[PDB]
Amino acid sequence: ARKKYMEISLLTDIGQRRSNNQDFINQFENKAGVPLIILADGMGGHRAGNIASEMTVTDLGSDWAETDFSELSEIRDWMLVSIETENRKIYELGQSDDYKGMGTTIEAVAIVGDNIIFAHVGDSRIGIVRQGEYHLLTSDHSLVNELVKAGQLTEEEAASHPQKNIITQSIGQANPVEPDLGVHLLEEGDYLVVNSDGLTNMLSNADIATVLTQEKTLDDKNQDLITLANHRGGLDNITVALVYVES
């Protein structure tokens, strides 16, 4: 019950080094006017990553469009439920054709007034940029983060771990998924930054904060983010949702 005008910008890019974009991103709006942004990073050889990412985003968002709710707790019930049905829908689909290792990350973000609530599965990320500073909101579901949490690495040690991130859960797996949820307040001038790993593997947090500090449109800033990610190497698909909170 605190109306803020908010600008949303979506962009996806294949990257310099890849010939297939298995990321998917889209926005939706339910019958009560509540926007939802869904970003998904798919994995799996010849089109299994494409299918999983586009299916999750399209199915959830199409179901979202038919809903009625305007409260956080109702939206939260919806996220926990829909993600489990999509998890078993993609696993089943992974089994019945021979799709080796089909799965996707998810970030699902709904904006109620000036609050956001997210559901998060994988190594995609959500951050807030305020007064030139990036605040990380999600924790990567990765091998190195499990080692920290069990007391086998320090946080400093994981930051310089030499192996690539092996994901520990994704949508389309046999066991039920455990998504992370979070409610946060957005302040005037903030930027919500929702991205797949292709942004943040190539750019530092402060680099992202730098791009968004300029006086340019949101759409131009999002273009600058992927251009920079490509200049740094572009080794993976880059996909970003930006939300700016108007003053």
Comparing CB distances to Mg ion, the nearer of 172 and 244 is 172
**The only residue of 15, 27, 37, 41 in contact with Mg ion, by rule CB under 5 A:** 41
Residue 25, number of CB atoms within 10 A of its CB: 21
CB 195 within 8 A of CB 125: yes
In eight-state DSSP terms, residue 142 is B
Task: Give φ, ψ of 14 to 5 degrees.
Answer: -70, -35
**Which residues is 12 bridged to in the sheet?**
239
List binders of Mg ion among 57-96 (CB under 5 A). Answer: none
Shortest Å distance, C-beta 212 to Mg ion:
21
Stretch that binds Mg ion, among 13-21, 151-159, 168-176, 197-205 (CB under 5 A): 197-205
CB 18 within 8 A of CB 244: no
Stretch that binds Mg ion, among 15-23, 55-63, 144-152, 207-215 (CB under 5 A): 15-23
For position 22 contacting Mg ion by CB under 5 A, the verdict is yes
Residue 94 C-alpha from the chain's centroid: 22
Shortest Å distance, C-beta 114 to Mg ion:
30
Comparing CB distances to Mg ion, the nearer of 9 and 104 is 104
Count residues near Mg ion (CB under 5 A): 8
What Å distances lie between residue 65 and 31, 36, 39, 171, 227, CA to CA? 6, 9, 16, 21, 32
Comparing CB distances to Mg ion, the nearer of 41 and 107 is 41
Give the alpha-carbon dihedral of 129, 132, 136, 142, to 10 degrees. Answer: 110
**The only residue of 99, 172, 197, 238 in contact with Mg ion, by rule CB under 5 A:** 197
For position 239 contacting Mg ion by CB under 5 A, the verdict is no
**The only residue of 79, 236, 241, 244 in contact with Mg ion, by rule CB under 5 A:** 236
Residue 237 is encoded by which pair of tokens?
């698909």
* Binding residues vs Mg ion (CB under 5 A): 22, 41-43, 196-198, 236
